[PDB]
Amino acid sequence: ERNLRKERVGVVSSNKMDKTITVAVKWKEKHPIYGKFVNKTKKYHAHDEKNECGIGDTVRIMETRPLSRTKRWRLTEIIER
Amino acid sequence: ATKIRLQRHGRKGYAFYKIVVADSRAPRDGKFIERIGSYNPNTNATIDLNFERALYWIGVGAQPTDTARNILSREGVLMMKHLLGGVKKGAFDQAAA
Amino acid sequence: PTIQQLVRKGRESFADKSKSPALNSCPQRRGVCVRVYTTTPKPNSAMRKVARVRLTNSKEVNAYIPGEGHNLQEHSIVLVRGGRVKDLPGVRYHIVRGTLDTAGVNGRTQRRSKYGAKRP
Amino acid sequence: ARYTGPKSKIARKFGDPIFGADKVLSKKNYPPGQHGTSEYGLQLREKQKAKYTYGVLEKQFRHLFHRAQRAVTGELLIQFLEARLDNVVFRLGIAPTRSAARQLVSHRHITVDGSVVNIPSYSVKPGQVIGVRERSKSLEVIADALTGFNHSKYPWMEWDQSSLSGKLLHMPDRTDIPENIKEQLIVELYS
Amino acid sequence: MTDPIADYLTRLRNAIMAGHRVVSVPASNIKKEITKILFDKGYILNYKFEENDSQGIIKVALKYDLKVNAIKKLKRVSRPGLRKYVGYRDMPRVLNGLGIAIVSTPRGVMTDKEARELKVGGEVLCYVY
Amino acid sequence: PNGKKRKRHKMATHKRKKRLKKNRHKK
RNA sequence: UCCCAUUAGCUUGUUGGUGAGGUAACGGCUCACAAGGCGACGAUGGGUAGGGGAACUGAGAGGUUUAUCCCCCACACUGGUACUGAGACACGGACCAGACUCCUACGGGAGGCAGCAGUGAGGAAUAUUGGUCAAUGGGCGAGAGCCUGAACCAGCCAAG
RNA sequence: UACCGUAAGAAACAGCAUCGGCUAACUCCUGCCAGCAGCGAUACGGAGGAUGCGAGCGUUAUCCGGAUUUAUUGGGUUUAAAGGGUGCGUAGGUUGUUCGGUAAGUCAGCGGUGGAGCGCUCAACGUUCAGCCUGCCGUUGAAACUGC
RNA sequence: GCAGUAAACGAUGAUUACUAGGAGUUUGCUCAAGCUUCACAGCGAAAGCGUUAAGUAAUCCACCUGGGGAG
RNA sequence: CACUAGGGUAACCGGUGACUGGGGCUAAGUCGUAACAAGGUAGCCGUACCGGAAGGUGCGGCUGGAAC
Lengths: 81, 97, 120, 191, 129, 27
Ligand SMILES: [K+]
Ligand SMILES: [K+]
Ligand SMILES: [K+]
Ligand SMILES: [K+]
Ligand SMILES: [K+]
Ligand SMILES: [K+]
Ligand SMILES: [K+]
Ligand SMILES: [Mg+2]
Ligand SMILES: [Mg+2]
Ligand SMILES: [Mg+2]
Hints:
This is part of a larger assembly, with chains A, B, C, D, E and F.
Chain B lengths: L1 E7 L8 E7 L10 E7 L5 E4 L1 H10 L2 E2 L1 H8 L6 H4 L14
Parallel strand pairs in B: 1-5
Antiparallel strand pairs in B: 1-2, 2-3, 3-4
Chain E lengths: L3 H15 L3 E5 L2 H13 L2 E7 L6 E6 L11 E3 L8 E2 L13 E6 L2 E4 H7 L3 E7 L1
Antiparallel strand pairs in E: 1-3, 2-3, 4-8, 5-8, 6-7, 6-8
Chain F lengths: L3 H18 L6
Bound molecules: potassium ion (K) (7 copies) and magnesium ion (3 copies).
One potassium ion binds next to loops of chain B.
The structure holds four RNA strands.
Function (chain E): One of the primary rRNA binding proteins, it binds directly to 16S rRNA central domain where it helps coordinate assembly of the platform of the 30S subunit.
Protein name (chain E): Small ribosomal subunit protein uS8
GO cellular component, one term (chain E): ribonucleoprotein complex
């Protein structure tokens, strides 16, 4: 009977750093003024206990407490390689 | 502490008070946690009051001012003595008098 | 333009200039009569009385003197308001009559409040 | 403020006898001035005719107009103008003219529902009682206008002379109010 | 091609302006749905679908009075450069209810009347009157 | 195609091209 | 969640890992390998703004501006350090360093008017060195009660 | 609230040749006036009348709408301002037809959150309930269209 | 080898689909490409454009926001 | 460790300066007549050279030109 934390599904964009990865989340949303639908992307930093993620992977990450200067997410699953 | 008090929300020469639950440090007419009624001393004094919420706040321990204590003494809000299960289980009816 | 062109660039809106920039968004200013002279209109052929005044906002401008008969002179403190004269290039301000050194028009019985004359 | 000026000049300007009967309505009847028209002129004449015949100034008239617009707009503006304390007192016949009714209301002489109201612009809702003050039921001027005249030509006033009161049954329709005002002109001007 | 639906509307409009009796179109599923909607709503005389070796052909015979066409204006709304999405509560009325708007919805392709009846929204393809 | 439109453009080009020649060889 | 590309690269505890210390608490917050991270979806640098609900104003799209009012933030002549406290940018508390101003009796000391009111100057322009804690709200007190330039009022001002 | 003895103590300002509501006579014939057509007088100054508004009336300063004068709703580029000298091409934008998956856009449901009275003698104004929350978030479903 | 300008003009960007007739001309064979002037609907303020649109529509790019100062 | 204070080099934001050059408006005093008609040598665009001044000439282009 707990609360729920934020979850983000994304694509791995960098893994050159030890025990941490970068996840890119992209979505299409409506422009406020002209009403066109444009693409936007955001980059998250996630903590992975093993360097088991290569460049490009549909993954899910979950919100955590600050684990570093810029590290607030943790890996949960790998949808595909 | 959490208090039950009146904010002057009216016009010059016509005082109309709002009965709210607010911190003691907040300004008189500023911030409050919950509105629990109204009060008008100009008539012969009309009082609006949320009985359930007033009971809840006086139970969790909000301290009322003197005038708000009199307003709660009216409308029978201080019946917590009777509702404390004082060696009984029924509910008396003193509102008719 | 196309929708994507508008998304990339957008629309730009300019700012309308103020017709009385020396007032610095004030109704009236105070000045001193640096010079009092006369000018000729640009098909009128009159002799219009003007004063060059240095306002307290660190600016010098030319102010017309409306009415017939002015008691002003050089080095006189005057109140300057907006309003330009069509047939006179340059000047774009008026001097309020009946305020500070400027006196009201003598012998006025109509339009008195526009020239600072009291009820007779 | 109030007009408090010459009335025959306005009467001769507008042609109609807004204030009542006068010899100047038939002798020397022309607009005033030693020297005496666009649709703006006629609209202004109509609006000023309403204002002068009801004793209303410009800001109050505009407030009445847009109140009627909020709640045919020209049709109910006329009944809003009619529903006034001074106008109702004048139509009840207890006072000779509308200026006399306004003065009587402004002075402590008229009560509404038993309480004295001295604002001569108070809107009177239907089903309300307007009556003379019980301390002023025996004035020399107060009786000759009501008694003797006894017009009672309006099918929306109840008089009840036995109590000196009066009641408004309902707001009369635009056809039964004897005012020569084209409300279409005024609503077009203010539109 | 960029907008086949706009091309279909343009072909119909050009045939109406030229005063032809029939008009041919390279077939598509959404255009079959649109011409079915138009025929059941009473804007064209009749239609016919011919499934050939290509994607197919749609032949439309238009409706004229005893010489004014039944269709006055066709206006494409949701173009590729700017897609338009609306709900049932904010759907528009064409010619103050005397014209129709073809709308693609999760329940299918129908007009604004049927869409408001079924309480569903989607894409506004075109205004027809 | 009034003609007087191009006369102003021709005239200011002459002033610009002449102003540069006065200091071309002038070091 | 503002403009400028007549602002194109920025960063070297900067990015991450191990360990330790410190904190109410996670954390390069601090201290002793790998090298990274962020950028044409505008990093970095420069200029200008306190931010919202309100209010005004447009059929709508919206827009303008925070005059009164309410919520959040920052500040108390200018900087630095803290201390006491449940809680501190410490608004009628310190210490030190800088302007500036005032008084001594030349050995020595004081103030910060961004609390309420006089006065002067600046300006086109904005008021009493007023009364009361009677009401509402605060602080202390077992209570009575004491204090409250908050607040209630009054005075002045073509004044909406 | 009540009592005497009295209309007694209380009306200005602007503009009247067109736009605009409101015209005779005297001056001047520069002095002047103006938002524009402009007059230097049915336009300047006074006198008589007139017309607005009214304890206010005008002048100046600032901001919106008409303005579509930045145009998504809702403008244009032969000659009025406006097609790059012409191509190739990077990022980006757009994507013929059809069969299935998914659920990012899209759609729907369910939750959480953020006019009528009464009193001012009337009114501004106070105050209460019916009434929007149509912004954000969570959670269930749909698959025609866009995306994958 | 530099330079990078023009009334570098059809004063008319590229692509795709559709919509009437007359008079010629070149090539490939009555048909399809191209080449220029009169001319329906339509467009335009008008002159005019009119299947080689300045008509009907869709996609992307470039540019304009009164005249001088001033390219 | 840093608040200051001190020297020095480097930026940016600003004033002033012997002297020396554009532009706008008002006057119009002077000098010619470049454009508008085939404006009396058709006009204009680019470029180069040369003149008190508008301009002239050479080379290429256009018709927003006559006239044949
Ligand atoms: K009472
Ligand atoms: K404490
Ligand atoms: K008190
Ligand atoms: K033609
Ligand atoms: K010549
Ligand atoms: K020549
Ligand atoms: K050429
Ligand atoms: Mg008033
Ligand atoms: Mg042009
Ligand atoms: Mg070209």
